[PDB]
Amino acid sequence: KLHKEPATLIKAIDGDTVKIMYKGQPMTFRLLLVDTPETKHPKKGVEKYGPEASAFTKKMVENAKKLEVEFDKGQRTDKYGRGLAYIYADGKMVNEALVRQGLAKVAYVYKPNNTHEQHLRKSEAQAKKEKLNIWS
């Protein structure tokens, strides 16, 4: 079973990336299973709904009393050294909240880091049906 661990916010960096203190060390975390429009994307720069996805994640992790990280069952870091995880703000998964609001798509999935995949796809189908943001 996955297990949540306590973490402390350092800085939100973008819609899909947060800097956090994990087990004493500063680490950059990439949110698992989701792709947000970015403000600092490799090629295009500041895509549409990028500033909005980015403000949403920031508000949510900045206003939390408790932040927790939940690693999946596969690799826990990507090739850039970023932690790969589900992030929770007072019990609410940030990854799902973004998708539920139409501020993210469900990424291309890579087994076995896919535990909450179905859960996320269910929220994504709902945000599309509601025609929210990215889906508007």
Swiss-Prot record:
Biased composition (Basic and acidic residues): 116-132
Organism of provenance: Staphylococcus aureus
Span of the entire protein shown here: 88 to 223 of 231
UniProt superkingdom: Bacteria
Protein name in UniProt: Nuclease A
Residue ranges, annotated region (Disordered): 116-136
Binding site for Ca(2+): 16, 35-36
Subcellular location: Secreted
Active-site feature positions: 30, 38, 82
